[PDB]
Amino acid sequence: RFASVYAWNRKRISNCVADYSVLYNFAPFFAFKCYGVSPTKLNDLCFTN
């Protein structure tokens, strides 16, 4: 029941350690377009939030 584009919900994530290397198996994952941050340099970066 994901929300609409006009009315979206923010899912705050602050108490856990986030690795993306195994979340690819929860959906077909049609798109993985993103920015200068390296896709492999996502599991190690210590984001403030």
């Binding site: 690819y24 049609f30 993985f32 896709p39």
Partner: protein, 49 residues
């Protein structure tokens, strides 16, 4: 111009980072995953230029 010359491009992805004063002439597809792409350049496989 409205589109700009596409002759001048820059690389985005490679397995190993650069060494001082080395050229990297190569037309390939970076494999951002465990999918052996043959040049389709779709999901988990991107054009570096």
């Amino acid at each position: 111009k409205v589109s700009g010359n596409y002759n001048y491009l820059y690389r985005l992805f490679r397995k190993s980072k650069l060494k001082p004063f080395e050229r990297d002439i190569s037309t390939e597809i970076y494999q951002a995953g465990n999918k052996p792409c043959n040049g389709v350049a779709g999901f988990n496989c991107y054009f570096p230029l």
